[PDB]
Amino acid sequence: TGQTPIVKANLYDDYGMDNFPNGFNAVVAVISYTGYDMDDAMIINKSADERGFGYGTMYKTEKVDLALNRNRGDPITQHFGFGNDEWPKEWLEKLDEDGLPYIGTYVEEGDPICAYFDDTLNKTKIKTYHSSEPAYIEEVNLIGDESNKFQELQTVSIKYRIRRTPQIGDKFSSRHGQKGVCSRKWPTIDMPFSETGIQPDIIINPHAFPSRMTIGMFVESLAGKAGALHGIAQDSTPWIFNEDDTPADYFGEQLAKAGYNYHGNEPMYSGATGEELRADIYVGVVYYQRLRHMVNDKFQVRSTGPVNSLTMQPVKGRKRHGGIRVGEMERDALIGHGTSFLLQ
């Protein structure tokens, strides 16, 4: 769900950036309410996420080449499909008669992603799909082997569609360098609700702004709100405004004319107690961007996994059920506490 910025520099159109949307316009409230948002952590609305807000997908392509061992036109023992007489149980659920997978099929690690038969071993083998993230088949392409043609097309490009909903840990940022990880997906009933009846899509903590000094975001908030109400895009090109002609006064006048508070505030009520909050909360429309990185792509757990032959110590590799290294500094720290059994 790509969206055109309300607040934008006019050069955005000059480069036709609307052909490739990079974010979405979100109702952002500068509020410290949940208690889970603080400095590097921000809150996303549950009901917003449930409605497809900031939803993304990730496509991965694999090349299954049967020229891996054969070279210089050697006779081939291998061939896409299934060999007669030998057939291990329930493989037909993922692959079609040709040995290639059905485009649209759900696959998990261990499931067969393709099927072939090599004459050298006289057995029907399969190339397994292996990744922590399950996928669906988006595209399967069969490719001619060239090499003076003649030979059957073993070769093949398979595209995986991995659905990626916003997870706790995923980074989100405004166009002002204010990035924060998703601390929690807060429910709309528990979310603070505006006088208008709107609950923010994203919650940014007010303690982020005094150190970063991202006032561009503050003016973006009252500009985005003004443009959403009146239905007009605003120019946010640098040095357009002056010390005499302030944007806070410009969009402030626009906000007052529409029927809202001049200083971009809104009277909000608590989602828990239901009572009106102490003061009016700073709410607006800010263009937010979802960063591509998973929060913990490096998320791992090992009880007792494989070990190297020489050292007989846990082997390196997250996906390989590898061990976490306790280096010299952690050794030093365990000596530090005088905690000899923890070191042992």
């Binding site: 690690e109 261990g110 292996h130 059920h321």
Partner: peptide, 27 residues
Amino acid sequence: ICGTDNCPSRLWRIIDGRRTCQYGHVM
């Protein structure tokens, strides 16, 4: 075939992270 006092029965099953006998024990 493992060869343990126990009897494997063939059909060894690979578990990612754990290779176990379909039956009694797991390496």
